[PDB]
Amino acid sequence: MMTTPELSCDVLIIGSGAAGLSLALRLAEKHKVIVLSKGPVDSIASHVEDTLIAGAGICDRHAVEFVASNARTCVQWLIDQGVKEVETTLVSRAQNHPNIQVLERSNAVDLIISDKMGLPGPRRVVGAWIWNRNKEWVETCHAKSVVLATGGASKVYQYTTNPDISSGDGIAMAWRAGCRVANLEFNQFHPTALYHPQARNFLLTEALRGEGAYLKRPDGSRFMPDVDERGELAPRDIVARAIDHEMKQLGADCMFLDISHKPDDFVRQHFPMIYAKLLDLGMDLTKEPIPVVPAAHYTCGGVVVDDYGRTDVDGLYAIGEVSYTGLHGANRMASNSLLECLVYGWSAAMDIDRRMPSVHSVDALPAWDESRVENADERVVIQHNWHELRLLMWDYVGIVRTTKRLERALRRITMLQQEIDEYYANFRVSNNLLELRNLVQVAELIVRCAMMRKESRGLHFTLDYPQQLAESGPSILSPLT
Numbered sequence: 001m002m003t004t005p006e007l008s009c010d011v012l013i014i015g016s017g018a019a020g021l022s023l024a025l026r027l028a029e030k031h032k033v034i035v036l037s038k039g040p041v042d043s044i045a046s047h048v049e050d051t052l053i054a055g056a057g058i059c060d061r062h063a064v065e066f067v068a069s070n071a072r073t074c075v076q077w078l079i080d081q082g083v084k085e086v087e088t089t090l091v092s093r094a095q096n097h098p099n100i101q102v103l104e105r106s107n108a109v110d111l112i113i114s115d116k117m118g119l120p121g122p123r124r125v126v127g128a129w130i131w132n133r134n135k136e137w138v139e140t141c142h143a144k145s146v147v148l149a150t151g152g153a154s155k156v157y158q159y160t161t162n163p164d165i166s167s168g169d170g171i172a173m174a175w176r177a178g179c180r181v182a183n184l185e186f187n188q189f190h191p192t193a194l195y196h197p198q199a200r201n202f203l204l205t206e207a208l209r210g211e212g213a214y215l216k217r218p219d220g221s222r223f224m225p226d227v228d229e230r231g232e233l234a235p236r237d238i239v240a241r242a243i244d245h246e247m248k249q250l251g252a253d254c255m256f257l258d259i260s261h262k263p264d265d266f267v268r269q270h271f272p273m274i275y276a277k278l279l280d281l282g283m284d285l286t287k288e289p290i291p292v293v294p295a296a297h298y299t300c301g302g303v304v305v306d307d308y309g310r311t312d313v314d315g316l317y318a319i320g321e322v323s324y325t326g327l328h329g330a331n332r333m334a335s336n337s338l339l340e341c342l343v344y345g346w347s348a349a350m351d352i353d354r355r356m357p358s359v360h361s362v363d364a365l366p367a368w369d370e371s372r373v374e375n376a377d378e379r380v381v382i383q384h385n386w387h388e389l390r391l392l393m394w395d396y397v398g399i400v401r402t403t404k405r406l407e408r409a410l411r412r413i414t415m416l417q418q419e420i421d422e423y424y425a426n427f428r429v430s431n432n433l434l435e436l437r438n439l440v441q442v443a444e445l446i447v448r449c450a451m452m453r454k455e456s457r458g459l460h461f462t463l464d465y466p467q468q469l470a471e472s473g474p475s476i477l478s479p480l481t
């Protein structure tokens with residue numbers, strides 16, 4: 001049962017995006033930090049008002065003012081660290097810091113909570129079990145504090161702009177550890193991702209439509225003027241809903257983006273990189289329409305945190321897209337996702353620093369169960385379930401929602417949960433199984449938040465409740481009820 005941990009640190013940071021790496025640089029000035037990477041590593045007043053408007057009336061004003069007031073000093077700190085040229089600096093710094101150990105190709109399995117090993121005092125995180133992909137075994141990491149910085153949950157959807165950072169593992173682990181989550185119905189979709197077998201999540205920018213690109217049905221006709229007087233210039237969420245409608249109504253695999261009516265020099269001049277990438281895949285931006293589908297892009301909800309980035313579990317923090325701070329409300333304003341992870345990283349660091357002397361090391365932790373069950377055919381079904389989840393979320397908790405579609409999603413999600421419990425119990429850990437467990441867990445939370453909201457607001461659009469409620473707030477789920 002109890003054994004000496006393979007790994008020990010003062011702060012375990014799960015996730016290696018901008019949020020995780022910038023917090024790592026802050027804390028590693030004083031503390032031993034491990035970073036787990038899944039793969040290779042205007043006035044304040046107007047910002048506040050713009051954020052509140054973007055959030056469609058359910059922003060937490062306290063959080064909005066917190067981020068807007070501290071934005072400039074936290075961005076200056078980032079610049080002084082030596083500044084996606086931000087990622088180049090952060091990755092280089094994190095890999096060359098004496099007090100940071102970057103562990104690549106390692107997946108957190110679950111958080112180790114003190115009350116499950118008879119430690120006295122209020123329950124707190126004391127470490128995590130970690131799947132080492134190169135060694136194919138589960139290790140134990142002792143940590144005095146743990147920070148979730150794993151990104152969002154967009155991978156629950158079959159189309160996603162950034163799959164490698166959107167598996168929802170931080171949200172699922174926090175839920176299993178007893179944390180509230182919130183606002184998981186507010187998922188931002190990019191309207192025009194390239195639909196091609198070798199697209200590698202390539203995005204067609206809205207600048208194409210800004211310069212006059214048309215959005216076409218498979219038969220060549222333009223659908224945007226039929227639904228919005230601004231046509232292809234409508235706001236992002238309106239374009240995404242229209243594409244979703246056309247695809248589902250027509251049973252079409254994709255819509256099409258076409259600038260071919262513009263002269264060829266106009267196209268090559270304004271979008272040289274887009275023109276270059278598409279001809280490499282066999283598509284001519286100056287002659288033919290480009291196949292596009294919407295794609296899940298950003299999770300405005302997540303693990304509930306306070307001003308310090310503290311979750312409901314002592315010692316456990318969450319910053320960046322994995323967290324729900326209240327900053328965003330029902331939608332996202334562009335620049336706020338970076339400001340959020342800098343400001344809450346600063347305040348998390350302050351709290352972690354002040355808390356550290358009171359935390360005493362644990363010299364023995366519960367080892368991972370043997371988990372030796374193996375059936376090769378059942379292992380293949382894990383992949384079927386993974387695809388089934390991502391498709392049902394696209395259909396039933398997608399861009400356009402209805403009450404009856406949400407019911408179908410919850411029914412299937414519940415079935416998958418019960419099957420996972422029944423069929424994969426004590427299965428040997430694998431990346432696919434961990435991802436399936438987490439995707440299904442977070443899908444349940446997403447659909448339960450979407451079902452709670454009896455109105456259309458921001459990123460939550462339901463045909464059954466087209467209007468906004470006069471008074472509203474966030475959708476909060478508790479695992480303790």
Ligand SMILES: N[C@@H](CC(=O)O)C(=O)O
Pocket residue numbers: 016017018019020149150151152319320321322337338339341
């Ligand atoms: N904090 C990053 C994403 C992340 O790593 O959570 C951003 O949204 O800018």
